[PDB]
Design an enzyme around this catalytic site. Sequence first.
Site, PDB file in Angstrom:
ATOM      1  N   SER A 204     -18.985 -10.229  -1.875  1.00  0.00           N
ATOM      2  CA  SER A 204     -20.138  -9.362  -1.972  1.00  0.00           C
ATOM      3  C   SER A 204     -19.889  -8.156  -2.880  1.00  0.00           C
ATOM      4  O   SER A 204     -20.837  -7.686  -3.515  1.00  0.00           O
ATOM      5  CB  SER A 204     -20.643  -8.949  -0.572  1.00  0.00           C
ATOM      6  OG  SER A 204     -19.878  -7.875  -0.068  1.00  0.00           O
TER       7      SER A 204
ATOM      8  N   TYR B 230      -1.016  -5.188   7.436  1.00  0.00           N
ATOM      9  CA  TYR B 230      -1.533  -5.718   6.181  1.00  0.00           C
ATOM     10  C   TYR B 230      -0.438  -6.394   5.366  1.00  0.00           C
ATOM     11  O   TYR B 230      -0.631  -7.484   4.834  1.00  0.00           O
ATOM     12  CB  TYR B 230      -2.148  -4.569   5.380  1.00  0.00           C
ATOM     13  CG  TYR B 230      -3.027  -5.016   4.256  1.00  0.00           C
ATOM     14  CD1 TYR B 230      -4.269  -5.603   4.503  1.00  0.00           C
ATOM     15  CD2 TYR B 230      -2.630  -4.849   2.943  1.00  0.00           C
ATOM     16  CE1 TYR B 230      -5.090  -6.015   3.443  1.00  0.00           C
ATOM     17  CE2 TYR B 230      -3.439  -5.233   1.879  1.00  0.00           C
ATOM     18  CZ  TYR B 230      -4.661  -5.815   2.128  1.00  0.00           C
ATOM     19  OH  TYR B 230      -5.422  -6.204   1.051  1.00  0.00           O
ATOM     20  N   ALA B 231       0.706  -5.741   5.292  1.00  0.00           N
ATOM     21  CA  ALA B 231       1.897  -6.263   4.624  1.00  0.00           C
ATOM     22  C   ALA B 231       2.329  -7.575   5.282  1.00  0.00           C
ATOM     23  O   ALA B 231       2.511  -8.571   4.620  1.00  0.00           O
ATOM     24  CB  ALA B 231       3.049  -5.194   4.620  1.00  0.00           C
ATOM     25  N   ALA B 232       2.381  -7.621   6.596  1.00  0.00           N
ATOM     26  CA  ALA B 232       2.739  -8.887   7.275  1.00  0.00           C
ATOM     27  C   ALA B 232       1.721 -10.000   7.016  1.00  0.00           C
ATOM     28  O   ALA B 232       2.094 -11.147   6.830  1.00  0.00           O
ATOM     29  CB  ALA B 232       2.898  -8.655   8.749  1.00  0.00           C
TER      30      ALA B 232
END
Lengths: 248, 248, 241, 244
Positions: free
Chosen positions: D15, D155-157
Amino acid sequence: DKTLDKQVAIVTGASRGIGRAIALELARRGAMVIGTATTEAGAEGIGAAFKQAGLEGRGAVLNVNDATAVDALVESTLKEFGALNVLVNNAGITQDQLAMRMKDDEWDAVIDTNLKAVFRLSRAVLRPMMKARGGRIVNITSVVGSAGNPGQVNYAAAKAGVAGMTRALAREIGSRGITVNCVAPGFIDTDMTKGLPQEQQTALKTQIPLGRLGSPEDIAHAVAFLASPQAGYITGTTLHVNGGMFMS
Amino acid sequence: DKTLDKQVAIVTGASRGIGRAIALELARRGAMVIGTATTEAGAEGIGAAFKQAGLEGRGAVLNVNDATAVDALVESTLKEFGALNVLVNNAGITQDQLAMRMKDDEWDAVIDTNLKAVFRLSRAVLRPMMKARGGRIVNITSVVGSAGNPGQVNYAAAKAGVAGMTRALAREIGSRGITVNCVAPGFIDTDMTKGLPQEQQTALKTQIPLGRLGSPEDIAHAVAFLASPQAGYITGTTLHVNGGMFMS
Amino acid sequence: DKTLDKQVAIVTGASRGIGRAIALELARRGAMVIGTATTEAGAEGIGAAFKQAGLEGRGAVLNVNDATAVDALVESTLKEFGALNVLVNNAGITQDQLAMRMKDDEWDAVIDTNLKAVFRLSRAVLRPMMKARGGRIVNITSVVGSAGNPGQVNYAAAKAGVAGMTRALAREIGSRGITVNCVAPGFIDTDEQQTALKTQIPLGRLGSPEDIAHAVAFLASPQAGYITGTTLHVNGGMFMS
Amino acid sequence: DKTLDKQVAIVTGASRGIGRAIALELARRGAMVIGTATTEAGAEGIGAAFKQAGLEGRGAVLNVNDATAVDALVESTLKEFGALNVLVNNAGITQDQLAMRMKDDEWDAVIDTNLKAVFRLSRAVLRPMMKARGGRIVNITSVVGSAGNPGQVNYAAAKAGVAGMTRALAREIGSRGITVNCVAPGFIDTDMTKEQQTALKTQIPLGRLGSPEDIAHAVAFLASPQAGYITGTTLHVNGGMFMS
């Protein structure tokens, strides 16, 4: 198609296989391309391949270990064409041998051609590119630089070293608008691999999740993408083109 | 304490900071250590540092670019000790300069000392290690190998080169039980860094999540661990010791 | 010898093979070690292994997926010992299946146990380590996280996830002195299918549990205090970086 | 021009920013694109973006966390177009928090959406792909997957997990001709990114934030028949911020 329109490119080691497919593909995208070979039959073959493909482009003789000839090519290209926009470093020899038995000259010749020559050419082209605040250097390395291979300690060292050099160059050139990257082929179908016996060829395929050898065009398309303006945010990286043989 | 009891170790460039800590530490674990320096004072001081800490150990003069000298060190070491179990390649110099201004000699010196010499010395020690079916090569590189750094394109090349070589040699000689590994120091507190003004040193620390420069001893322990029998399943890797400055 | 003298360490999944060898090697170096298992039999076998070695150490039952039981073990460890210096995340199971055939619960079981458990336990132990301005989190991952492996897409994702969390967590808590690292076993001999494994391995042999224990014990020591956010690969050359 | 002519592609999270640029770029190259968003609002906008460009393509609503809706998107797509050649996994959230304060639902949310849903989506498109012996899955990850970042342990994982999945899957599905690759943006100028900007730039050798089009062009390259020997890799698009 013509993302490289009016750009001027040098491809070293453009006579056969990978270097030839890179040369042709850059010309196909609108670039004027000088491909180099170590002999006159090679330079002539490069010209003849452009013409067979119905493209503009030249072959030239170059010993990438000769600083005088490298500098001369940079001068003549700038003189004839006014610009030097893309360098693709695909000159490179192997002199494979077990480290135990490896002679100093077998080491040197691989380091010279594959690492030192890449530095010297890159430094030579960078002077005009840095001044123009534009350019592309693409170094054709090899999966062996990332994964190693028995019998190729010299080749592993040299190609890992080109990656190392690439990263440092990218950090050095900064906001100057030049990107420097490597494309790392795995096992590509060429004369070098087509000549080896079926049993060894299959041993290579076992290593490869996609189950086939790559093509010189696989490499050409990856180089052409990096050479494009549309890849201008990519620098200091290796694009692995190896059928899944090495992953990172 | 004595995990390297009765082992014999050569540590090149053992005169100050990291090389000296590595040498002392290997000695503390029961190895006989020949530490090398480029000059005779350097050699004497290495003896005196062992002497001083209450440890067996020897300084010796070696020019790592001199093949004759390299082979003579191996030969003499085998003659006296009957074995050569650990090689730590720490001989290295930097010749920092922008790639643009970098003289051929500045590139050559860094490549010959930091890469070619590593291959030569490695090759010389493989003869005894191969026949013994055992040994350790630990190459001291640098975070600059993995990450790059402005001013150090030659150093980045050489050190990335050592890692490349390490992986290939590990594959080549793994069936004989020799491990070959690197230890990549980050920013380590030495004379070189002590030299800089606080503003310069604080600018180093900011790239380091642990918020401090490392010590010669951090590297020393890293190396002592890889050298030990207890690290015999570790091969062809880089043990980063950089405080989180580079992660992989 | 005693580089961990008076330290308190928790090792999750310490009942057999790699976990057991780790637990014991830490105890050998002076640490007081609580090893966890999913069952009482596991917990008792952990206690028995310390006693057979003539070491101090304890077995406890832990479901690493129960967040209550995890904060509760950290708390019950502090109460009794007043310190928590080392965590080794070795809990983790596999649920191998081709991704095409893989059920959602085979994906969840592996992610929960190998990745989420590692978050929960690391978060839990961070409180006393953050408070104490020191500590060691060593996560046992696997070569599979780096190189992939067919039939192990869940395990690869989990273990690769653990490395990525490690790196982020190392940057996040580095000022406070805590190190966070991974040890990645290759093929370890635990409990011509064996000849095809060795083919992949330059050293030509399977690793031992002790190879992992020694790498972990190294990273857990004060002398490894400048190493953080890395993966120490212990795989015989099967995967190099 | 039409390197993706007659191909059918699903782009999740299409989007805004990256997903939108990708969706449009794939359509300019001749692909029929279904771009998804959580809300029918984002779906309508996706439709409008294609109309604005004079392009074929459409928007669909998708909770990438809903097993049933995921499988039904693939089913309807095969039903209507007879093929499903490309998946781009772009849907993704952040829920940043210091790990030691992070809640279970902040961990779960990032992992469900950024990792589990990527697995679900990929598993569902492999059925048609494997029967066609051809396809592309391109996962949009992030430099944070490779270099880590304070506040972003979840987020990193998740992102590093996606890269790990991609390698295992490339090995599993390589023999059928399907490629699975990641594209890892660095700092890209979006409505999320747009002295705060100045700080971010010192980390980037090229000296500037990237664009959604930088990601879209990388994605379009990997999606092309011409990138068919590239698998299991991460293509970093980060201005030199992380070099591998």
